[PDB]
Amino acid sequence: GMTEYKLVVVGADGVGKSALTIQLIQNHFVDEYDPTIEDSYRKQVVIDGETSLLDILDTAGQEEYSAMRDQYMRTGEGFLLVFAINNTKSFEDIHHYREQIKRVKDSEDVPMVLVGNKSDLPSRTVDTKQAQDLARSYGIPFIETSAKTRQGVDDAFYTLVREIRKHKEK
C-alpha cells in the first residue's frame, strides 16, 4: 500500500529550505527562488520499498504567523530543522525552532531531523561536532546536506519519514 507524511521544513531565512525542497521534488538545484514564498509541495517517492506521498511545507516569513503554518504546525508529523554550515546565527537559532515546535505540539517527542546544509561550501563556521552534539542532546538524527550537489537530500527527508514511522507505532 502507501503512506502519506506531512513534513515541515523550518530554519532561518537563506539556509536552503527551498533549495532542499526543490531538490527533493524536482531533482535539481534552483539557486534563486523567492525567499518570501511559503507553500506546500506534494511528491510521491518510494522509501524502503513503500510508496510514500510527501506533503511538504517549505516555510517562509516565519517572523509573522501565516495561515499555512497555523495549519501545518498543528497537523505536521515531522520537521526538518535546517541551518547553513557557514551561518553561525542560523545554527544558534535551531534551539528556538525546536523549543517552539515542542510547545505547539505539547510534546517532548516530536519527530525531527537536524540538517546542516551548504556542505559544499569552503568556509564553514559551524563544526560538524557542535551539530552532532546538539542533535544527540535532542535524541534526533543529524544529516549533512548540500542542496547544490544533492548530497544527503534524500537521506534528510527519508530519515525524517523513518522518525515519523517510529512515532506512529507508539
Partner: peptide, 14 residues
C-alpha cells in the same frame, strides 16, 4: 522574532 504558530512568539534576534 519567531512566530511559527499561534500563540507562540520567541525573540531570537538578540
Amino acid at each position: 522574532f519567531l512566530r511559527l504558530a499561534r500563540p507562540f512568539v520567541s525573540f531570537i534576534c538578540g
